[PDB]
Design a protein around this nucleic acid. Sequence first.
DNA 1: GAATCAGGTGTC
Length: 222
Amino acid sequence: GIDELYKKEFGIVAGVDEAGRGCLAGPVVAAAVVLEKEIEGINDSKQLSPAKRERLLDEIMEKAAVGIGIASPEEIDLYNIFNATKLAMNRALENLSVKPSFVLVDGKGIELSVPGTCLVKGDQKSKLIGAASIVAKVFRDRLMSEFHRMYPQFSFHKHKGYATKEHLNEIRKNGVLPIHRLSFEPVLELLTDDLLREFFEKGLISENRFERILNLLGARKS
DNA sequence: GAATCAGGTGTC
Ligand SMILES: [Ca+2]
Ligand SMILES: [Ca+2]
Ligand SMILES: [Ca+2]
Ligand SMILES: [Ca+2]
Ligand SMILES: [Ca+2]
């Protein structure tokens, strides 16, 4: 009832959610969704099965206005994952062709460029948020698969860059990449300033990012 | 789908 209630009062309402807070590699992805038609079975995203999420997606993209926003591994390393997530969400809102007057954002502590409110477990209280969580996850899983193709030695298509045993194995065996979040503890502990300087000289990371991670390596660790 | 192992970080 959330959505409809908020629509009476505010007009165009979008639901916003992100995917990729907790992984070790790749961008964080956010989606903003405005939806008027009914879509049955929207219940969350991490609550669903991959087969299902693909089914609801096809219907969500038929019936809903969607905006997708991304913040890169560099932005995560420089701004932290909270601020990177906020940025991806604000970018999702900009990418929505329909301009929302109010937003419902999954989680808490988040104020976007559009006035709205935060719902803990929003993904299971709101259909709009539930839809956004599906779009976010699916779209990001698509990007991650694309990386596996770019980095054949890494099973990105399976673990989606999260800290699974297999992913950690691949990092030790194959080495840290620029798409890893170099500020994240497990990646940071396998890094050397040697490889970091190599990334920089090859131009694979920015100076600002080089500088930040070099400082973190030094602080590693008391 | 739900339990229950694993393992990332931010707000307060
Ligand atoms: Ca989510
Ligand atoms: Ca969320
Ligand atoms: Ca949740
Ligand atoms: Ca610093
Ligand atoms: Ca395991």
